[PDB]
């Protein structure tokens, strides 16, 4: 059996060497058969097979045995993969010295040159002693696939990988704390590196692949508000094109655009509608996409009383004339208490065009008393153009469309402003983002470079709840997370004036969690019966407490954010003072942290960041740490994903011992349990949460989800202070 090498030279097969590596990789794993792997891969060998191909074959062999019954194959495959990547980058298993590596990469143009200016060779020597390359042996197969696929520095054309996981982690840390005083700089670098290398803190895909390289584009979320004017419509559109070329998710508020038929310039023109403009936003969003579908996503918001709401509600409906359909954008309907009350009483809802009702739109977000006043006034005013619809009809039309597409989202505007970090009089929250978890203030532009406009941006990350022993571990973790992301806000580039304005003014952050499901599993709690309410309350109090502590400490050191005076925090108001009171009936856990000490310290020294927390979905970050995604229950014990190399399988964390503890997604009898946990989480979260709603046809008579049930769950969510609602999953069975 002849073997061919990298230079294309022939050597004789050495089956004992292969076995050694397999043995190595298996160390410490349970229920994995080395022979099983050898049988399956040896049969595909042949005379003159390249060495790389042998590696791929054994890797896949291992990978194909991943299962619930033997989840440690995930690691057998992983380690084999890691081994192969080491040799692929360094030409041996052992990684080079940090300094040598960085020098080589800087010379090749793969790493930023500032790294060498910012740190001395002695400092790089010191950093090398922090690194633990044996941490590469703790990844799961799925995780290594992601790492190799979209994180590790590489040549996309030639397929060459230039680095390994541990250099990624150390250098990310290096970059983010490069402007720190020399007395504390490396202390912070080591602590952050440990956090992320031992999976305690999860960082977003953009940061993970970019920080350390020459780029400066790290923005993933941008919220744009569009005024009712051709200049603003053009500005918005221009802004989206710039941002989607750089991979940012976009949240667009286009609620002010006047309705179809409305007058233009007087009576010399009569509006064309919003649809046309919506279609213009869609092409802007998809402007940097392969073909015109792929990547670049956006969620467009509008009030429920808009005059064109019935046409807006069915924009993604897959059945209709092309000129009345904007299918490739998700929508977020904005509701408030008044609208829900009309439904409960079986009354009508009046539809108005924003241009015809002075003060109404603003009141909708910042003052519910004033909104009701104005709203009833204008209903009776006969000079105002309006339309009446039955609240049950509108809610069902909306819910039918949300049920069938899964992508018609809700946003409770009152909850977003009565319980938030911002003062609604000065900086109201009028929209959300792509995934409905960000909620930041925005101002319309009159031109792309308008400096008086405001585009919201948000930097994200997350805490791995399955990697901490006790909740007081979150103090260190919050320090590292806040400090690193605040440094990033000054590191990255801002293509549009208005976006820099918001980032430097308010320095807003969005830190959330991953691995919730696993966490609940190991504490013997479930989602559906209410058994996790108090633990969730305890857990989310810790997270918010320590995050505010971190941000507050940072403000002492480096000054609060410019526009800190527009926050409720500035007035001594806290998350615990404005939450939805109904919550008291479903959770009795006490506060365990000193919120009153903190209240005073915030008032006095302020916050570096106007917002700190936001619960977001995560697929890719969770994969790297073999964690359940965000706060959602797994759909099953094993995840299957498609790849060029083969089928990727990932087994939920500690399946061996917790299989009966988990509560799979379709096992829950309803949404109540989960909706209560979201409510409890929203007590303490600055922004919002990407809540889902899930329905299974086979649990209902005749396999049809009753509208009654859909409306009931909507109301429940409103009752416990839920700000937004993301996807609606319906089962395919």
């Amino acid at each position: 059996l002849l073997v061919t090498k990298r230079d294309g030279s022939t050597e004789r097969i050495n089956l004992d060497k292969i076995h050694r590596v397999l043995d190595w990789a298996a160390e410490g794993l349970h229920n994995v058969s080395i022979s099983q792997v050898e049988l399956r891969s040896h049969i595909q060998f042949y005379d003159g097979i390249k060495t790389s191909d042998i590696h791929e074959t054994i890797i896949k062999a291992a990978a194909d045995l991943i299962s619930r019954d033997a989840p440690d194959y995930q690691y057998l495959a992983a380690r084999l993969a890691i081994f192969h990547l080491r040799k692929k980058a360094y030409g041996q298993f052992e990684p080079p010295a940090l300094y040598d590596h960085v020098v080589k990469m800087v010379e090749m143009g793969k790493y930023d040159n500032h790294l060498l200016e910012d740190y001395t060779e002695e400092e790089f020597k010191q950093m090398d002693t922090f690194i633990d390359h044996d941490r590469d042996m703790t990844f799961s197969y799925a995780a290594v696939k992601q790492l190799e696929g979209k994180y590790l520095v590489q040549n996309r054309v030639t397929g060459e990988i230039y680095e390994s996981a541990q250099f990624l982690y150390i250098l990310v840390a290096a970059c983010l704390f490069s402007n720190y005083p020399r007395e504390t700089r490396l202390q912070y670098v080591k602590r952050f590196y440990d956090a992320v290398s031992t999976f305690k803190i999860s960082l977003p895909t953009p940061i993970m692949s970019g920080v350390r390289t020459p780029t400066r584009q790290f923005s993933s979320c941008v919220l744009i508000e569009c005024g009712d004017s051709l200049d603003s419509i053009n500005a918005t559109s221009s802004a989206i094109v710039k941002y989607v070329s750089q991979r940012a998710g976009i949240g667009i508020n286009a609620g002010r655009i006047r309705a179809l038929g409305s007058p233009i310039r007087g009576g010399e023109a009569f509006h064309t509608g919003c649809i046309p403009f919506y279609k213009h936003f869609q092409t802007a969003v998809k402007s940097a996409s392969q073909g015109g579908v792929r990547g670049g996503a956006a969620t467009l918001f509008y009030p429920m009383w808009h005059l064109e709401v019935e046409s807006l509600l069915v924009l993604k409906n897959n059945r209709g004339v092309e000129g009345n359909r904007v299918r490739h954008m998700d929508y977020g309907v904005q509701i408030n208490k008044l609208m829900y009350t009309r439904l409960l009483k079986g009354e009508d809802i009046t539809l108005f065009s924003p241009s015809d009702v002075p003060g109404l739109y603003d009141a909708f977000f910042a003052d519910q008393e004033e909104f009701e006043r104005l709203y009833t006034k204008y209903e009776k005013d006969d000079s105002i153009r309006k339309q009446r619809v039955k609240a049950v009809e509108l809610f069902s039309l909306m819910m039918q469309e949300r049920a069938s597409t899964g992508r018609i989202y809700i946003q409770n505007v009152d909850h977003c402003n009565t319980h938030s970090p911002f003062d609604p009089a000065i900086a109201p929250v009028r929209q959300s983002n792509l995934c409905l978890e960000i909620a930041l203030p925005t101002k319309p532009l009159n031109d792309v470079n308008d400096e008086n406009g405001e585009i919201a941006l948000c930097t994200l990350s997350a805490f791995n709840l399955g990697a901490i022993n006790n909740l007081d571990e979150l103090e260190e973790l919050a320090i590292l997370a806040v400090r690193a992301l605040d440094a990033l806000l000054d590191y990255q580039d801002y293509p549009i004036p208005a976006a820099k304005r918001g980032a430097m003014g308010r320095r807003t952050l969005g830190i959330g969690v991953i691995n919730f499901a696993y966490y609940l599993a190991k504490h013997g709690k479930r989602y559906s019966d209410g058994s996790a309410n108090n633990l969730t309350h305890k857990t989310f109090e810790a997270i918010q407490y320590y995050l505010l502590k971190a941000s507050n400490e940072l403000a002492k050191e480096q000054g609060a954010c410019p526009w800190f005076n527009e926050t409720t925090y500035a007035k001594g108001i806290l998350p615990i003072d404005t939450y939805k009171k109904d919550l008291d009936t479903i959770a009795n856990e006490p506060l365990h942290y000193d919120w009153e000490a903190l209240r005073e310290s915030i008032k006095t020294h302020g916050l570096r960041n106007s917002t700190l927390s936001a619960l977001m979905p995560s697929e890719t970050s969770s994969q790297i740490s073999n964690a359940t995604n965000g706060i959602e229950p797994p759909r099953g014990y094993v995840s299957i994903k498609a790849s060029k190399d083969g089928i990727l399988r990932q087994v939920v964390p500690d399946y061996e011992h917790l299989h009966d503890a988990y509560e799979l997604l379709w096992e829950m009898p309803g949404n109540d349990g989960y909706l209560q946990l979201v409510g409890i989480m929203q007590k303490f979260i600055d922004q919002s949460i990407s809540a889902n709603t899930n329905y299974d046809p086979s649990r209902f008579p005749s396999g049809k989800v009753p509208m009654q049930q859909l409306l009931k769950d909507l109301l429940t969510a409103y009752k416990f202070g839920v700000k937004t609602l993301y996807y609606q999953n319906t089962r395919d069975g």
């Binding site: 079986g346 809610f395 039918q400 009753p706 009654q708 859909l710 009752k719």
Partner: peptide
């Protein structure tokens, strides 16, 4: 599949 049947008399009691 959904069953579009809304009972407004049942929802009316709900407290927001």
């Amino acid at each position: 599949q959904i069953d579009s049947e809304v009972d407004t008399d049942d929802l009316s009691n709900f407290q927001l």
